[PDB]
Amino acid sequence: QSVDIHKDQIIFSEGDAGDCAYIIEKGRVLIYLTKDKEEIPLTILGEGEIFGEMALIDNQNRSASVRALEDVRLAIVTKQQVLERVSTADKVVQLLMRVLLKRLRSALDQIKLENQIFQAFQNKEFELFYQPIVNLKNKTITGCEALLRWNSPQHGLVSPNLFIDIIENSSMVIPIGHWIINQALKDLRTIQDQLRLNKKERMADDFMMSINISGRQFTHSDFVNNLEDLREKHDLHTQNIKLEMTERIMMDGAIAIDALNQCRSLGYAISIDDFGTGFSGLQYLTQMPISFLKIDRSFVMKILSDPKSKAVVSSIIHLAHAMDIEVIAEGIEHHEEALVLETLGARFGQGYLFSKPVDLGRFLKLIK
Amino acid sequence: QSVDIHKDQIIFSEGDAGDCAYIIEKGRVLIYLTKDKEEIPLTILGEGEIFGEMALIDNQNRSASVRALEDVRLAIVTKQQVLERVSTADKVVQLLMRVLLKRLRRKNIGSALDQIKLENQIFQAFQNKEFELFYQPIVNLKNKTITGCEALLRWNSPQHGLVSPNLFIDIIENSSMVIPIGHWIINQALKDLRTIQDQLRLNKKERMADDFMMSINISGRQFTHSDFVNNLEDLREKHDLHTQNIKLEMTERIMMDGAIAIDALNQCRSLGYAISIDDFGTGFSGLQYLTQMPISFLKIDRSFVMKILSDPKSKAVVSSIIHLAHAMDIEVIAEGIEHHEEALVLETLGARFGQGYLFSKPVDLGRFLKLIKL
Ligand SMILES: Nc1ncnc2c1ncn2[C@@H]1O[C@@H]2COP(=O)(O)O[C@H]2[C@H]1O
Ligand SMILES: Nc1ncnc2c1ncn2[C@@H]1O[C@@H]2COP(=O)(O)O[C@H]2[C@H]1O
Ligand SMILES: [Mg+2]
Ligand SMILES: [Mg+2]
C-alpha cells in the first residue's frame, strides 16, 4: 500500500525506533543529521530510491533524520519483508551487507573450497571413470556411465559428495562440463574401435555412453550446438550418446521445454537420473521425450528387507514399460537383488555386483 | 589460493581497476585516501575482515588505497565468485546492496516493487475481512454419496480479478502472514465442521456424521513453524471436535526438511489426524520417503485428470498412482472431474473418491448444508 505525505513533514528523526522502510513513488526527500542544533545535509533522494532500510536490517535506531522537500507518495516496505529476504540470501551476500552497514555508520572456507576445486581442475587432478551397465538377463556389458573423480596428491582420493554440488551450483560447470563431454566422447570412440577390432560389430553399434548433464549447462545457450561440434570432432553417432538429467530441468521453460525435443530430433537418447527423488516426474514424464529412467540406489538397497519399497519399484518398472521407457536399476550389490529386479522386469542394471567404476584401461580389459 | 604479502606493500591504490577482493588470514592492513600528498586514514582491518569487494560489485574503480602494516597473508575472493552470489540474490536484496555502495562512496569523500505491494494489499484485505471459506464436496464415486468436503479460500474483491486465482494463495503461503491467516482458516473451518456434524446428527445420520472428513490445506511454513500442533489442538477443543474428522492436506515439499518434519507428521498421526498429500505427482517427489510417511490419502491433481481421455499415457500415469496407493493402504481422491466419462475411467482404474464440477463447485456453508440432505 502507498501513502501520501505533506511538504516539510519530519517523517522520522535520528535515534527513533525502526518500524519500516519506504520507496519513493513521487517527490523528493532530504536526509540530514542534527548536531548542537546545526542541520547538516547528507543527500536528496528522488523517485525509485529507498530509505529507512538500515534500521530494519540490523535492528538499530535511525542513523539520520528525514524530511519531505515537497508533496511525496511513499510505498511501504515492512520490517518482516526485509528480514525475510535478507535471511534467505547467500551467507556471503549477508556478510557483504553487514560490512557495508558498519562502514556507512565458514564463508571463508566456502570461498576457498570453490577456488581449490577450480584450481585442481586446471592442474588436471580430475579424471573420468566409467561404470559398466549390464543386460540383467545375459550379463553382457551394454554400455557405461561416465563418473567424475578427483584425486589430489595431498588429500588422497576425494569424495564426490564434496565437489559435485559445489561445481553444479557454480558457473564453473560450463568450462568443466565442456571438458567432461569432450573426454567422455573421446573415450567412446576408443571403446567402439576396440570393440570393432575384436569383431564385436553388433555390440559396438548398440553401445551407449551415459553422460551426466546438469541443469545450468543444459539451460545455457549454445549447448546443443557445442555438443554437436564435439560429437563430430570424434566422428561419433548420436544413437551411442545418452544424456542423464535430473527431473528439475522442466521447472524452467524458455528454451528448456523444446530443447529436449531439439536434442531428441537429432537422435540423442534422454534419460532421467535418480527418478523418484527431488522434483516429481510423473507429469514431467508425460511431457518429456524420455527413453530411459534410472531407479536410484536408495530404492534398490531396501527391496529385500522392506516389502513395500519393493512395491514402489515394481510400480516404476511397470509404468516405465507402459510408455516405452526402459529401466536401469542402479546400486546392485547382491545376486538376490538382481534376481528380484529381473522378475519385476527391469532390463538393465549397474552396481558393485557387476563392477565398480574403473579407469579406461581397466574398462577396455573388462569388455573382452 | 592464499597469498603472502610484505610489510609496507601498496596492495592497490585509489582509482585502480578491480580484479579481485581479499580476506585477511594473518596481519593488519590500512585503508587510506590521498589528497595533495596528505594521507588520511579511514581504518585498520585485521584477521577475518574483507576488503576490495566494492569495486567488484558495481564494476567501478578502487574507492581507496590499501597498504600492509606488517607481514600479511590474504585469501583471494575473485570477481566471478562475488558476482555469481550477488546475481542469484533477491531483487530487493540487490537494490539494498547497490544503494549502500553509492552512499558509502559519497560518504568518505564528502517487479519487486509490485511483489511487495501485492503482499501488503492481500494482508490489508484479510484485515478488512474480504476473505471467506467455501466448501467443495468430496463424493464416493460408486454410490455418489457426499463423504466430506475441502475448505477453499476465496477473496471477494474485484482486485482479486486474477481469474488465474491461485496466485494469491501462493503469495500467502510463501510469506509470514500465513501464520495469522492460517490460524483464521483453521478456526473457521472447524467452526463450520461442528455445524455440519450437528445437522447430520439432527437428521439421524449418525454414521455419516462419524465418517465425515473436513479437509484443510496446511502450508509448509505453518507446518514447520513451532507450536503448530499445540495451537491446532486448542482450536479442535475450542469447538469440541474429534481428530478423526479433521484431514490435513499438505504439499509433497515438506520432506525436503527433516529436523522436526520427519516426526512432526508422526506426532500428528499419533493424535489421530489423517494426513493427505495434495497435488501428488507435481512439484517435489517424496517417493523414497513415501514408504515412511504416515499418509492416509493422496489427491490426483486436476492437471492429470483433464488429460486422461485424450492423452493415453497420462492415463497410464494415473492408473499407476492408484495401484501404488492401494499397495500401501492409501486411498485416492481424484479431483477436477468435469465429465461423467472421466468418472467412469477413474472408477474402473479403482479410485474410491472424487471431487469436481460434475458433482459440485465450491459453495458457501448454507448451500452446502442443503446439499447434504439430498
Ligand atoms: N549517508 C547517507 N546517504 C544517503 N542516505 C542515508 C545516509 N545515511 C542514512 N541514510 C538513509 O536515512 C535513513 C535513516 O534511518 P535508517 O538508519 O533506518 O535508514 C537510513 C537510510 O535509508
Ligand atoms: N569507509 C571505509 N571503511 C572501511 N573500509 C573501507 C571504507 N571505504 C572503503 N573501504 C575498503 O577499501 C577498499 C578500496 O577499494 P574497493 O572500493 O574495491 O573496496 C574498498 C573497501 O573494501
Ligand atoms: Mg548419474
Ligand atoms: Mg487442496
Author numbering:
A (entry chain B): 6 to 110, 139 to 401
B (entry chain A): 6 to 115, 139 to 402
What does the article say, verbatim?
Herein, we provide high‐resolution structures for an EAL enzyme Bd1971, from the predatory bacterium Bdellovibrio bacteriovorus, which is controlled by a second signaling nucleotide, cAMP. The Bd1971 domain architecture is predicted to consist of an N‐terminal cNMP sensory domain (cyclic nucleotide monophosphate, postulated to bind cAMP or cGMP), a middle linker region, and C‐terminal catalytic EAL barrel. We reveal that regulation of c‐di‐GMP hydrolysis arises from a domain‐swapping of the “regular” cNMP fold, which undergoes significant rearrangements upon binding of stimulus, communicating a series of conformational changes over 40 Å to license a productive state at the EAL dimer interface. C‐di‐GMP turnover was increased ~8‐fold in the presence of cAMP or cGMP, further supporting the proposal that cNMPs are activators of Bd1971.
The crystal structure of full‐length Bd1971 was solved with both cAMP and cGMP ligands, to resolutions of 2.63 and 2.46 Å, respectively. These two co‐crystal structures are effectively identical other than small differences at the ligand binding pocket that are discussed later. The full‐length cAMP‐bound form reveals the sensory N‐terminus to be a domain‐swapped variant of the cNMP/CRP family, which in the cAMP‐activated state holds the C‐terminal EAL enzyme in a phosphodiesterase‐active conformation. Bd1971 forms a butterfly shaped dimer measuring 90 Å tall, 90 Å wide (at larger EAL domain) and 40 Å deep. The central twofold axis acts to situate an EAL domain dimer (residues 158–402) over a cNMP sensor dimer (6–111). Bd1971 dimerizes around a long helix (residues 340–357) and a shorter helix (315–321, referred to as the compound helix in BlrP1 or repressor helix in MorA; Phippen et al, 2014) that follows the catalytic aspartate pair (Asp306/307), and can thus be assigned to the “open” grouping that correlates with active enzymes. The dimerization interface we observe is centered around Ser348 and places Asp306 and Asp307 in a productive orientation, similar to that observed in other (presumed active) EAL dimers. Superimposition using the cAMP ligand reveals many shared residues/structural features between Bd1971 and CRP including the classical base capping residue (Bd1971 Arg108: CRP Arg123), phosphate cradle (Arg67/Ser68: Arg82/Ser83), and ribose‐coordinating group (Glu58:Glu72). Due to the relative C‐helix swapping, the hydrophobic base capping residues (Arg108 and Leu109) are contributed from the opposing monomer in Bd1971 and the same monomer in CRP. Importantly, the linker helix (residues 136–157) is central to the productive full‐length bound form, contacting three separate domains—both cNMP sensors (one chain via the N‐terminal end of the C‐helix, the other chain via the outward face of the β‐sandwich), and the EAL domain (at the αββα start of the barrel).
